[PDB]
Amino acid sequence: GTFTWTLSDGGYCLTRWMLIEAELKCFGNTAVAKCNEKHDEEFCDMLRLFDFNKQAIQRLKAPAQMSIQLINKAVNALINDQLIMKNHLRDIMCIPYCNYSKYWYLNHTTTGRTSLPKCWLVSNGSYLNETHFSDDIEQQADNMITEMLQKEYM
């Protein structure tokens, strides 16, 4: 059916081991909460796989023999497999797509507030230039401003 896993830990943090050449990064509840409603965010699906792995290791006995049976059952509660299919279709059709590696987000200069990361797209073996999707970056900047203003008006 649809995802159900709830991240266990407000906000959510990615530790140093989960990031390439980076230290601990934390996102607040406004951005994290979006992972409980949207079905098209690659970042949120990865966020659930990392959280799942963390809990599975801490809570279940590890067998001497390696096994992937837990993920074969848990996977549909964790990720949207049709998001994977969407990026696959974009790839075969020569449309820029997410390979779930690099993500970008906007970070407010005086408050440290961040957006939910969006996937940096790739095409023809490389990352797209910022210019090429600067329109989506600009739209997200306005979306962040809009949410901040609404909170001030509430």
């Binding site: 980076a22 992937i68 497999d81 994977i84 779930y100 590696s101 987000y105 200069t109 600009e138 401003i145």
Partner: protein, 193 residues
Amino acid sequence: SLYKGVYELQTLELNMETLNMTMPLSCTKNNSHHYIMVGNETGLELTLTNTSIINHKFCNLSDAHKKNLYDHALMSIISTFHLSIPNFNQYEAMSCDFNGGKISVQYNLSHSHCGTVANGVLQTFMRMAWGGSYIALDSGCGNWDCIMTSYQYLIIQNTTWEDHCQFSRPSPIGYLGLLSQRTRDIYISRRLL
């Protein structure tokens, strides 16, 4: 790069290596070699070559299952790959050897060109080793149904852990992406089944 005079664009890159203990991770070394790693000990080597290794028509799966000498995590991966091939009707195309608990699986891609075995096998490959899988094809994109490569064989064998990623980073996506479509495109082979 400052947007609206308010936000700095920042990046994040995920280290998917920490997911090794729960789920298989695949990556690209070069055009001929791609890998699937399991845990921190083993995995499969997926090679596109012009050299055959099995050189016969047998695939003794029933014998392998009875003996149970194979690593279950890897047999699971082989089964997911095989059942994901969209229109596989050429039993002769896939030969295997599971002697001693070893895994050796060979697909013959030579009859290529639209709607052929090589097409179905390569499409499955494209997803299993998705990080960089396209570099091994004659046409990177714009062609879904008549996909070709110059390599005659796709050989999958059990290997050991080593850092085999050069072209792309490890990712769980290929395997997980195949699981939901694992049995969706299969021909009927029996009246009762």
